[PDB]
Structure 1
Amino acid sequence: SDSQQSIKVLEELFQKLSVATADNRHEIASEVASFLNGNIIEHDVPEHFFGELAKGIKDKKTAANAMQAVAHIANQSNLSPSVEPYIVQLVPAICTNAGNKDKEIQSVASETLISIVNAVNPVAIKALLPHLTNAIVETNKWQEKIAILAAFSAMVDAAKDQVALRMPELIPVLSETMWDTKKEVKAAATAAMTKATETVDNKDIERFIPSLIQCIADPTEVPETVHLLGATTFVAEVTPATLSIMVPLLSRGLNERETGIKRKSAVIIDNMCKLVEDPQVIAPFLGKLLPGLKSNFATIADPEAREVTLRALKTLRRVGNVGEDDAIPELSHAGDVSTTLQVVNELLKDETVAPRFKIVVEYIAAIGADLIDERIIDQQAWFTHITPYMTIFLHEKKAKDILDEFRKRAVDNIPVGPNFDDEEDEGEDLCNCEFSLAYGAKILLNKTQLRLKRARRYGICGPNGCGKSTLMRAIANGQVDGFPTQEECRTVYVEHDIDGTHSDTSVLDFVFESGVGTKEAIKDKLIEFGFTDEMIAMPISALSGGWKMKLALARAVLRNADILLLDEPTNHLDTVNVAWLVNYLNTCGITSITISHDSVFLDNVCEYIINYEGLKLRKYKGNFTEFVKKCPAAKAYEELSNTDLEFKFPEPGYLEGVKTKQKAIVKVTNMEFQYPGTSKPQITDINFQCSLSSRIAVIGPNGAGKSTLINVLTGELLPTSGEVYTHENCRIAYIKQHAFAHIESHLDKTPSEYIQWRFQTGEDRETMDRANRQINENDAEAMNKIFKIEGTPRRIAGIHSRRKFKNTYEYECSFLLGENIGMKSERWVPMMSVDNAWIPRGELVESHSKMVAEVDMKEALASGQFRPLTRKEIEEHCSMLGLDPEIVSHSRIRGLSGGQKVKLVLAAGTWQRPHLIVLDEPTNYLDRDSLGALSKALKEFEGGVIIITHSAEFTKNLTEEVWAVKDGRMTP
């Protein structure tokens, strides 16, 4: 009913839109958007509307209007998942419009494409990308190609991790476009190419990227570029993105003319491919290299060139895992959209899915497939991204039960990659053993192997109590079958030596007694290690935090160690001293094996990880983080990273005048909202109060009234009538699933940088201005927007202050008056103070975000409400929400779990220590586990709580007040 009301509102608004002119177009587009993205329809979609929208886009007369509506609907912070799939479905029709002969239509189209790319859940990239590749490949309209190329570029910044994985498919499309006959298209393609390469993220070939792009543009530079790449010594993993950029060059190198080049190409092929840890990775490229290698092997006289070529050929065969007769193995299809789609369709065989929801099922399938390529398999991650789409036609409980199952089956398709080899790596072996390990009749390791390379740094991991320390002690004592003797390979178990020196004994004599060289030789090294004479002569009993560690390592040098064994070395060590340790280990030139609960430490030190898997040791190339990507079970170990518990929200910020938690800090009266154009207001005669003790639950089915109430409450929509009050310093945190899903656009940042990214402008970019496009940042000219005040044309000359205006902010603006408009003598003259005027935030942000920001910062500071984005403050805040300080300031979000990402996003959402927390359907994307922790946190929250839900079970023992909208009205 209140839901059937929504369908009507959309009709009125869409009616006004189709008639819209270039003058009011944006005004109504905005309305359509603010309404459509709200909780307006109960378990269904406004089918007719989308139908008219679709039709409107294909008609010259309404093309501009329809699309401009989409652009607004698809803004960066408010695109509702209930709407998203239907919007992406319009991309094709919109691409055609990007090729229309009419300038306005063509322009709006291009614009809309960028809007969408920046609006969709980055993970749904497999639902959107094919549309763009299909279009640009099949069209003959050059302008259309340029618009699509520009959308590709926007996508690089919008979904970088996601695009990286698509590289092998995207690079050849851009490469072909680089050869278009239209000069404008050649220009555009190269630019998109350069932008796209930003996802390679490989330090080893970075500097040569512009040399590779040029080569794609001109083959004649291949020999030149091959000659230029010979020396690149590869260290970082060779990803699919690396290959898509390298292989084509090399392939042309092999089929070159001169023997020198063929040889060089081979070297580069060999050098680079050996660093391919996964065969699936090199599979799609094998076809472009094998044939050229086989061929040259037969055709070139010189034997040196041959040996090289063979070596490359052999390398390729080994890594590729090619079957006999050079047959490339069958690629896994666990990530193939076609595959994930079958799984979902299958799981959906018995529930009656109407036709209008088919597109949604498709979306879900796409997202699912991408999560598998990204290897995101934890339950919360999937609930975060798919559940919201499913409740579009299913009930939460059913959707969640079906979802959990979909993830379990989709994950099971993930192929079991192989395990490691060391021989061809760089090192003269310190040991190579086959052995078993028993500690008191208990088997720790059985018929396993251990090979350590010289000057290499290792880390040993495994579930607590698996025998990590016993193994190290064993190595330390030479109780591993086949291990070299101390004379062949000196091991030094750092800080684990036992002797009988008096606490009286000096540091010098302490080491002297170890029989490691003359006292002279000892002072020498101790001084070189930073010891002062005073220290060398003092009693060991006085060495502090860092100095015993330093002393030990110094002894290791004098002992001429070959391997340094360390067990929880960072204990009792401060940050400077840990930093010191990290630097030393990375530069002492000796092999070191470490056991440490500090994953940050391990990431900074280890080059390899030896993991306990059963009664077997398994080697992985990379640090702890790289380790975890290749071995999920590790996220359940006892490392600093895996640590996850419950959380607490911070105490709200001080408020003067508020003595009791029952005092109203927000009180609305006779409030009413009505979209310009609708027949009757969406909500009216509204009255309510909020306090630090509030515990409200906005229940009921989605409808025109219920959403609009949420939208006025959260500041999005400015009430059309009535009085609104709130403390000057009252802050409301709005928690939507949007932020949870969209954090995937920042896997490259540390939790702390993410919090800065969302906060430095002074306000939460995630929730503030949800009713505006904001997409404006490169608008040097969009700053010349003309404001109509007192019937005169004006440009903003400056914004000076701020003040509350109902549920938002107004800003004091000085102006420039337009004169002789349209004439050669047109000029904008500065006006006087007297003519300044207050302008609502919504009318400024789109063209003057920067000035608005500088103003918000001032007022923040002037009211003492500003909280500084310092790494210390952010770690403290994140601590409360269950995240560890070291991980918050040094680890990249990419390594976090779905659950941890939940904490981080909540942390972000509550950083300004709000007084009222408004949660938008939290059960719609959080599993029972996450829901639990959230429940307790909300019970203990010292501020007001407003939960928008459908789950009564979730509201019980949590809320006490109830808000319900019936016929555009409601009563507390």
Structure 2
Amino acid sequence: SDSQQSIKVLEELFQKLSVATADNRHEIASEVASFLNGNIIEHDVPEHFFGELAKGIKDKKTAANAMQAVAHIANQSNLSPSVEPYIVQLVPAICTNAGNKDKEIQSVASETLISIVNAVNPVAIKALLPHLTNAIVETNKWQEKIAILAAFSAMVDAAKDQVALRMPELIPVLSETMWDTKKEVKAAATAAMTKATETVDNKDIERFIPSLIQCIADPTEVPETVHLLGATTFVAEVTPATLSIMVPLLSRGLNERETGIKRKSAVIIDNMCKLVEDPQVIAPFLGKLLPGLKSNFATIADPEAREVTLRALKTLRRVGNVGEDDAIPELSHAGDVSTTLQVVNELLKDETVAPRFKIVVEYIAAIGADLIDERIIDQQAWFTHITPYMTIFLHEKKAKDILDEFRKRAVDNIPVGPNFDDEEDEGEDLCNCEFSLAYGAKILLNKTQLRLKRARRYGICGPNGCGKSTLMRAIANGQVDGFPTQEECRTVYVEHDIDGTHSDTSVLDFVFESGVGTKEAIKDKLIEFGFTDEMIAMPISALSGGWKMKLALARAVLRNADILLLDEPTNHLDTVNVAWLVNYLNTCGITSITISHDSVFLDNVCEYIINYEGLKLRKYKGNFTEFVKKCPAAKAYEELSNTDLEFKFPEPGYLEGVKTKQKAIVKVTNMEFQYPGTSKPQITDINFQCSLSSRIAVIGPNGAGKSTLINVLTGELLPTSGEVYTHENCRIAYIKQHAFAHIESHLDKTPSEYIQWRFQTGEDRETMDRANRQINENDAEAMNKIFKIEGTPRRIAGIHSRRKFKNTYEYECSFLLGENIGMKSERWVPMMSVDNAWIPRGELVESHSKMVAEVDMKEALASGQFRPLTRKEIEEHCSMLGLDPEIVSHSRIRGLSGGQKVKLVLAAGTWQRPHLIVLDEPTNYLDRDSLGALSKALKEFEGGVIIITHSAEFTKNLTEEVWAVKDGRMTP
């Protein structure tokens, strides 16, 4: 019913929008957006509304208003998943208008595409990109292309990782467009191309990108560029993105007349491709290289060049895993939308899914396919991204049950990665033995293989109690069948030696009694490692952690080790020493094998990982994190990364005057809100209080009332009437699902840089200003916005102060008065502070976010509520929320589990140590485990808690005050 009320509101608002003028258009669109994006409907969609919007976009008479509405709805921080798939379904239509002859419809369409690209869940890229590529290749309107190219570029920033995986499909499209007859398009397409290549992210060829882009536009540079790339030393991962910009050049190189170039192309092909682990990556590129390689093999007279051609052809066949007759193996379809659409349609066969929800099911399949492509398989991840879309037409319980099955079936389609192959012989082998390892009648390893390459650095991982250290003892003590003898391959089990020295023997004497060398030689090496003449005379008993390690490694150089064996080497080592060790191992030139619960330390040292899988040893190229992608089974090892446990919210910042916890810090009376343009208010006669003891539950079905109330509570809507008392410095943290899903856009950031990113303007860019486009962070001419105060046109001279105004902030602005506007004598004169005015944040944020931010920092400091973004403080705060400092400061969010992301997003939301935590529908995107931890933490929060849920179970022990809107009213 309150749900059905939302429908009437939309009709009134839409009716208002349909007749909007070019001057009031934005105002009305914003209303539609603030309302439409809330919890206004119960398990359904505003159908008539979306039907009118679509028909409104097509009709030239209403095209600009309808689309402008779509743009506001598609804002960066508030686009609701309940409406998201119905918005993307309008892209084809909007792309069409981007080709319209009318200068205004074309413009508004272009901007709207950019807005949509910036608002959708980055993971639902597979539902959006196709519309854009379909349009750009099918249209004959050059302006429509320039716009679509603009949207591609925007997508690169909004979903860099997601785009990286679509590169093999996007590059061909951009390349063709670069050869468009229209010169403006040629310009736009190159620009979108240089932008697209930003997803490559490969240090080995980075500097050669601007060269590669030119070859696309001018094939005559092929020979010149092929030669430039001959110097490249491929070491980094050869991803689909790297191939999409490397292969087309190479392919043309193979077809050149000159033999030297055919050869040079073959060299690069070999060098690069021998670095492809998954035959899936190179599969779609083989057809562009094999034919040129076989043809060159039967045309090149010179034996040396021919041998190089064949050498490349073999690598390709190996890597690509081709069959007989160069038959390319069938590609996996795990990540195909078509495949996931089938999987979900099967799980919904018994459910009755009405026609208007079909587009939603498609969105779900799209999200699923991408999650599988990025190999995001953990439960919480899937719940975070898909649950809210299913509940559009299903009850939560059933939704989560089907979602988890969907995830399990989709995940099941991921092809098994092929066993690692050793064509990486840069230097000789240290060992290569077949053996078994038995420990007291217990079999640890059975007929496994061990091959270690010289100067390579390895890490040994495995399940607790599998013999990780027994294997090392065995290698150290010459007890591994086949392993070389100390004479051939000298190993030094660092810091694990055993002698009979006393606790009063000097460091020099100690080493000396080992026979390694002369006292002169020893002293020389000890000094080179940092030991002072004094330290060398003191008794070993006085060596601290860092120096025993330096001594150990110094002795190892004296014995002339070939392999350094380290077992938990970072223990008793301060950060400076660990960094010292990471550095030394990475530059000593000797091979090392390491065991260590410190995943970050493994990531900075290791190049390969020897993992225990049953009674077999399996190698994986890459450090620990890389390894984990290839073997998700390892997300259960006892390695710093995998550690996950409950968390706690921070203590709310001290409030002056608040004697007791029942003392109201928020008090609302006779409040009411009525959207301008509607015939009756959405909520009226509202009264409520909040204290640090509040334990409120906002229940009931979604609707005009419930959503609007919440929208006012959270600061999004300024009430139309009523009194609002907020204690000075009172702060609210609004935990929405949006932040959880949108973190996937920052996978290359570290948890620390993310929190810094979310508070770049002093305020939380995820919850503050949800009623504004804000899609104007890259602009400076829109700072000349003409405000209308008292009937006069004024520009902003400056913002000087701030103050609470109801549920938002007002800012003291000094203006410039516009005189003789539109004339050669136009001039803006400064108005003395007599005319300053208190403008609400919402009216400034779009045009003057900068000045507003500067003023916000001034006030935060002034009142002692500013929390500086220092690494230490960020680290300390993330620790409360159960995230380890090393991960927070030196790991990429890309490697965090779904659950860890929940923690990180939660940490960001509570960074300003809020006094009140309002949580919107937090069962609608969290799983059983997550809710358990969120329940315990919300129970111990020394601040006020407001939970808006549909779940009765979740209110258990978390509520003591009920809020329920009925007919636009509510009494606690």
**TM-score normalised by length of structure 1:** 1.00
Query: In the alignment, which residue of structure 1 is the partner of 2:588?
Result: 588
CA distance, structure 1, for counterparts of residue 403 and residue 267 of structure 2: 48
Shift of 1:417: 1.2
Give the whole-Å Cα distance in 2 for the aligned partners of 1:660 and 1:77.
Answer: 35
For residue 90 of structure 1, report the CA deviation from its aligned partner.
Answer: 0.2
Task: After superposition, give the CA deviation of every residue in 1:878-924 in whole Å (9 maximum; x if it has no partner).
Answer: 11111111000000000000000001100111110000000000000
Q: Deviations over 1:99-138 (max 9, x none)?
A: 0000010000000000000000000000000000000000
What is the 5 A alignment of 1:766-785?
766-785=766-785
Secondary structure of the residue aligned to 1:305 is: helix
Number of the residue aligned with 1:928: 928
Secondary structure of 1:325 counterpart: helix
CA distance in 1 between partners of 2:358 and 2:746 (Å): 30
Other structure's SS at 2:665 match? strand
Per-residue CA distance 1:380-423 (angstroms, 9 max, x = gap): 00000000000000000000000000000000000001111224
Aligned partners of 1:103, 1:797: CA distance in 2, in Å? 33
Counterpart CA distance in 1 for 2:309 and 2:889 is: 46
C-alpha separation between the residues in 2 aligned to 1:798 and 1:232?
A: 53
Other-structure match for 2:631: 631
Determine if contact 1:647/1:881 at 8 Å carries over to the other structure.
Answer: yes
- Give how far 1:727 is off: 1.2
SS at match of 2:157: helix
Q: For the residues of structure 1 that align with 2:314 and 2:951, how far apart are their CA atoms?
A: 61
Displacement, 1:873? 0.8
Do 1:431 and 1:452's aligned partners in 2 also have CA atoms closer than 8 Å?
Answer: yes
The whole-number CA distance in structure 2 between the counterparts of 1:930 and 1:920 is 15
- Provide the C-alpha distance between the structure 2 equivalents of 1:297 and 1:655, rounded to a whole number of angstroms: 79
Q: In structure 1, what is the Cα distance between the partners aligned to 2:319 and 2:778? A: 46
1:609/1:106 Cα in 2 relative to 1: closer, same or farther (>3 Å)?
Answer: same
Tell me, in whole angstroms, the C-alpha distance in 2 between the residues paired with 1:163 and 1:30.
30
State the match for 2:12 in structure 1: 12
Alpha-carbon contact 1:776-1:846 (below 8 Å) kept: yes
| 1:424 Cα deviation after fit | 3.7
CA distance in 2, matches of 1:853, 1:129: 35
Q: What CA distance in whole angstroms lies between the structure 2 residues aligned with 1:840 and 1:162?
A: 37
* SS of structure 1 residue aligned to 2:325: coil
SS in structure 2 of the partner of residue 316 of structure 1? helix
Q: How far apart in 1 are the matches of 2:819 and 2:692?
A: 52
The answer (yes or no) to whether the contact 1:696–1:963 under 8 Å persists in 2 is: yes
What SS does the corresponding residue of 1:60 show, helix, strand or coil?
coil
The offset of 1:453, in angstroms, is: 0.4
Per-residue CA deviations over 1:131-181 (Å, capped at 9, x if unaligned) read: 000000000000000000000000000000000000000000000000000
Residue of structure 2 in register with 1:115 after alignment? 115
> 1:960 Cα shift?
1.1
Q: 2: CA distance between counterparts of 1:861 and 1:514?
A: 63
**How do residues 154-165 of structure 1 correspond to structure 2 at under 5 angstroms?**
154-165=154-165
SS of 1:478's equivalent in the other structure is coil
Q: Distance in 2 between matches of 1:947 and 1:427?
A: 62
CA apart distance, 1:755? 0.4
8 Å CA contact retained: 1:760, 1:869 = no
Partner SS, residue 923 of structure 1: coil
Higher mean displacement: 336-345 or 418-427: 418-427
Instruction: Give the % identical residues.
Output: 100
**Distance of 2:672 and 2:810 partners within structure 1:** 20
Matched, 1:415 2:405: no
Question: Which blocks of at least 5 consecutive residues in structure 1 are unaligned?
Answer: none
The CA distance in 2 between the partners of 1:889 and 1:779, in whole Å, is 31
Aligned mates of 1:447, 1:28 — CA distance in 2: 73
Name the CA shift for 1:451/1:801 in 2 (closer, same or farther; >3 Å): same
Q: Report the secondary structure of 2:165's partner residue.
A: helix
CA displacement at 1:274 relative to structure 2: 0.3
Q: Does the CA contact (< 8 Å) of 1:340 and 1:368 recur in 2?
A: yes
Q: How far did residue 788 of structure 1 move?
A: 0.5
User: 1:131-150 counterparts in 2 under 5 A?
Assistant: 131-150=131-150
Give the CA deviation at 1:778. Answer: 1.9
Per-residue CA distance 1:815-857 (angstroms, 9 max, x = gap) = 1110011001111111212111111000000000011111101
Task: Tell me the secondary structure at the aligned position of residue 190 of structure 2.
Answer: helix
Q: Secondary structure at the match of 1:816?
A: strand
Alpha-carbon contact 1:435-1:480 (below 8 Å) kept? yes
CA displacement 1:571-626 (0-9 Å, x = unmatched): 00000000000110001110000000001100000010000011111000110011
The 10-residue stretch of structure 1 (824-833 or 641-650) with the greater mean CA deviation from structure 2: 824-833
User: Take 2:253 and 2:425, find their aligned partners in 1: how far apart are those partners?
Assistant: 26
CA shift for structure 1 position 760: 2.7
Deviating more after overlay: 280-289 vs 770-779:
770-779
In the TM superposition, what whole-angstrom CA distance separates every residue of 1:523-571 from its partner, at most 9, and x where no partner exists? 0000000100010001111111210000000000001000000000000
CA shift at 1:492, angstroms? 0.2
SS, match of residue 718 in structure 2: coil
Write the distance in 2 (CA, Å) between the matches of 1:658 and 1:778: 42
Taking structure 2 as the reference length, what is the TM-score of the superposition? 1.00
Displacement, 1:714? 0.0
Where 2:743 maps in the other structure, the secondary structure is: helix
In the TM superposition, residue 781 of structure 1 has moved relative to its aligned partner by 1.3
Q: Supply the RMSD in Å over aligned alpha carbons.
A: 0.6
SS across alignment from 1:161: helix
> What is the CA distance between 1:302 and its match in structure 2?
1.3
The DSSP-based 3-state class of the residue aligned with 2:923 is helix
| Larger deviation, residues 276-285 vs 779-788 | 779-788
- CA separation in 2, counterparts of 1:423 and 1:627? 18
Aligned pairs (5 A) from 1:923-962: 923-962=923-962
User: In 2, Cα distance between the equivalents of 1:301 and 1:568?
Assistant: 56
Distance 2:617 2:873 in 1: 41
Q: CA contact under 8 A between 1:230 and 1:268: conserved in structure 2?
A: yes
Per-residue deviation at 1:945?
A: 0.4
Secondary structure of 2:298's aligned partner: helix
Q: Give the whole-Å Cα distance in 1 for the aligned partners of 2:422 and 2:588.
A: 22
Matches within 5 A, 1:282-361: 282-361=282-361
Report what 2:497 is aligned to.
497
SS at match of 1:227: helix
The 3-state SS of whatever aligns with 2:419 is coil
Q: Is the 1:697–1:962 contact (alpha carbons within 8 Å) kept by the matching residues of 2? A: yes
| Contact 1:735–1:909 (Cα < 8 Å) also in 2 | yes
Deviates more, 1:295-304 or 1:332-341: 295-304
Q: CA deviation at 1:791?
A: 1.1
| Aligned residues between the structures | 972
Matches of 1:62 and 1:729, distance apart in 2: 45
Question: Residues 600 and 645 of structure 1: is their aligned pair in 2 closer, same or farther, counting only changes over 3 Å?
Answer: same
- Does residue 708 of the first structure (1) align with residue 700 of the second (2)? no
User: How far apart are the structure 2 equivalents of 1:425 and 1:923?
Assistant: 52
- Deviation of the 1:519 alpha carbon: 0.3
> Which string of whole-angstrom CA distances, capped at 9 and with x for unpartnered residues, describes residues 757-786 of structure 1?
001310000000000000011222111110
Shift of 1:290: 0.4
Name the SS for the 1:734 alignment partner.
strand
Question: Does the aligned pair in 2 maintain the 1:711–1:717 contact within 8 Å?
Answer: yes
Maintained 8 Å contact 1:476/1:491: yes
Whole-angstrom CA distance in 2 between matches of 1:326 and 1:350:
44
Distance 2:372 2:255 in 1: 36
Q: Which secondary structure state, in structure 2, belongs to the residue aligned with residue 30 of structure 1? A: helix
The 8 Å contact of residues 504 and 540 in structure 1, kept in 2 or not, is answered as yes
State whether residues 459 and 610 of structure 1, in contact with CA within 8 Å, keep that contact through their aligned partners in structure 2: yes
Find the aligned partners of 2:117 and 2:891 in 1 and give their Cα distance: 28
Distance 1:422 1:133 in 2: 40
Which residue in the other structure is 2:200 paired with?
200
SS in 1 for 2:516: coil
